[PDB]
Symmetry: C3
Subunit: 333 residues, 3 copies
């Protein structure tokens, strides 16, 4: 049976970008093959030069977004090169059995493995490393991403009418817990293992030191802001593998939102802000109507503006005065 199915290999891209795919399936079920390489590396996460030992899927935080269709088979080749120091694995919330695949994918440095699972449920799911005994440490070190399982006939609104996006971006939100000394300065370590003991004490406080989008404070700002034009329909996938978040598009809305990200449920309409539970991926669809800069944020404003959970969208087009206008510009009373 599987023997007889067609197979296509897909090369992943760096977040916030997503690999090429079809919204509405043009072929029947296939075996979609992906390859990911584990990369343990130093990453500076803020302006002051704070550095951490990140554990990544393909060198990025978050790992890349995989896109398949309902009932396709996902075949993943996972490589943990000998240059790494730790054992890793992968658990797909999209999969059924063996701890999402975690129990079948344990690889020490120098090993690789190939897992296959059937994508039976449509929606966006989280995938993350989960080694027995060090689960939270690997997850909060940036070792998580997401996979989107699109219905074979694309997305639909609450009335069952088609929703087609022109652009899609993937925003992975990460909570970090950097160990501190007595005065409050962040610690620095030589290898991941040296950090271990302190990492555990830092996590138990339940208070992140940083909460960032795409691995660093300011990662999606300035020259890296997400782009769009007035009239374009944009799908924004957002994941949080360990902690709750509440996305909000400043100056806009989530016209159609699947906060818990499962496509067999009708979406929520006109959301100002929505709650994505830790350990979940959600998706919001919106059509831009005004040009300018928009701030995309986690709406606990301290987490957004003090801790790093903020990104930008710079949109082009003509301003619509019917929607909004300054009647009297700021001036002396």
């Amino acid at each position: 049976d599987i023997s007889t199915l067609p197979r296509v290999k897909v090369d992943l891209v760096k977040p916030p970008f997503v690999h090429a795919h079809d919204q509405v399936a043009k072929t029947g079920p296939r075996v979609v093959e992906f390859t990911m390489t584990i990369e343990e590396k130093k990453l500076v996460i803020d302006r002051e030069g704070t550095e951490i030992h990140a554990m990544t899927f393909n060198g990025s935080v978050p790992g890349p977004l995989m896109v398949v269709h309902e009932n396709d088979y996902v075949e993943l080749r996972l490589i943990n090169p000998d240059t790494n120091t730790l054992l890793h694995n992968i658990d797909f919330h999209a999969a059924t059995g063996a701890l999402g695949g975690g129990a079948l994918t344990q690889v020490n440095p120098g090993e690789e493995t190939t897992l296959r699972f059937k994508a039976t449920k449509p929606g966006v799911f989280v995938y993350h490393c989960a080694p027995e005994g060090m689960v939270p440490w690997h997850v909060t070190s940036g070792m998580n991403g997401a996979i989107m399982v699109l219905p074979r006939d694309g997305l639909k609104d609450e009335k069952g009418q088609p929703l087609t996006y022109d652009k899609i971006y993937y925003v992975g939100e990460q909570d970090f817990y950097v160990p501190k000394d007595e005065a409050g300065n962040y610690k620095k370590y030589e290898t991941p293992g040296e950090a271990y003991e302190d990492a555990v004490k830092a996590m138990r406080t339940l208070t992140p030191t940083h909460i960032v989008f795409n691995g660093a404070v300011g990662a999606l700002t300035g020259d890296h802001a997400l782009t769009a034009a007035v009239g374009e329909r944009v799908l924004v996938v957002h994941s949080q593998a360990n902690r709750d978040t509440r996305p909000h598009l400043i100056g806009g809305h989530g016209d159609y939102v699947w906060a818990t990200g499962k496509f067999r449920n009708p979406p929520d309409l006109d959301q100002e802000t929505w709650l994505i539970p830790g350990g979940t991926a959600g998706a919001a669809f919106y059509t831009f109507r005004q040009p300018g800069v928009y701030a995309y944020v986690n709406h606990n404003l301290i987490e957004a503006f003090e801790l790093g959970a903020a990104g930008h969208f710079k949109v082009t087009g003509e301003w619509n005065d019917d929607l909004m206008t300054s009647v009297v510009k700021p001036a002396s009373m």
Copy 2:
């Protein structure tokens, strides 16, 4: 076009009360005009006399609830008198473009401005101050309120049948982060600017020192409890601009609840408790069936009973023994 529309001026009232309005629109689209004055002031928030420098819209925490209908135009005149010390602005989650209006409304002390926006989506939304670089500080100092955009034909249940409330109250929940000395006593400052540096460190802990309804511990209790009678349908609008909350009416339920507050979605039925994400306003409708005192609370009971998130409802009418009755009054075994 707008030139030709009728205009009505509306005078706002102090929360928990709401200005007069029609549920079902009796006229066509209008330009609804409001005026708000910014007031920086000292406020004692608890029993022990803890004082803070509140930044308010119209002198209250939360700012007043504005009520309009879908497709009306909201025209707001914002005044920042010369007696204030800081720059402020306003961002409406209900609006489209320019950061909800934040980028078009920056006024220094002594200035005013007039913004107009079209209310295209029905529901309850949050509005708040959001000056570049000091967003969380202004929001957590009480500078936020809400606006309700009612469908032109009023509220409806999941089956599309009309829901008419007899009373409406607005509950604004506020998380405060008062700076403390080494022993844990709260600090006091002369002006808002003197507090700034410490405020930022207090917020980063992510742990509020107080969480209150209507600006103070006990604000909605005793002589200030909300009132109703058995048989009255009450709509309770609740907002939280920065942090999640989970409202609950002790001894009652939320018969119809729009937890994320957007009226084009059918409401959730018979809720015991519901989650309102930080940066959102929600609404719950209930019909009183029993008389007596009810406690309205944020259901993290530590936040409610230790931190200040608790209010009362005292309802009049006849007791119904079919619903509840004490068969054997407390007595010695």
Copy 3:
């Protein structure tokens, strides 16, 4: 009227197990009688021997799950024996009036009382102790449980088709706040009253020291794991009386989930993780398709793996290679 109704007495069982009942009602409305005895006792909650003074309903944390049908009358006899030291009461979120029954059930040691209330709304609700002035202290000491009010015709899916479970388990999640000394070691006390003052300071930090299922770290693991077989439909009721949680079944899904637990609402489909607000009970239905061990967890992985919020399910049956298979077992590159 009530005089004329039939009455059945039901003996409760220890969580995670549930007392015998009918899903679809075979008789008409009845007066269902229950008896609960309050038990103040020492409980060691972790591996290191940390001990607390738990306040329980029937000797367990959580208290037992009561199951009735919509429109039955619940008659509870509550006994607070003279061996206890504190005043207690009970508030049912399922009931209407008198603070859920809290104001009608105050019993000092040596007293008992009998309350009756009509179960007008279907769903799973939380019930908990709530004495004026010490509400959070009694709740966070383990004094809470849940009650399920089933529709007279059983559970249904979003299309109104019947959902019948073969097994049902009750998982009560508890956040504990154990006082610590300067070095971080947990304190020990002789009686509940001796703990009081310190308990209040510990709770105000808003950071639990332990978050457990069924009263202790590891309570639902090893020889106590929940059991099932491939093909069995399992309903898992989960409650959290004070704090938000986000359940997740590792290696599985929530096929039908009522996150806020009210049965008149259609369930959410294919959830990976769902949010249950503090002060609420929810229910998830799932059909096992793969054998093996599954970890049932609160998906903030620090709370799950560091703090104690983790349990197991060991399921029997044949492995399905179509759903999942290891194509290449972990080996040297």
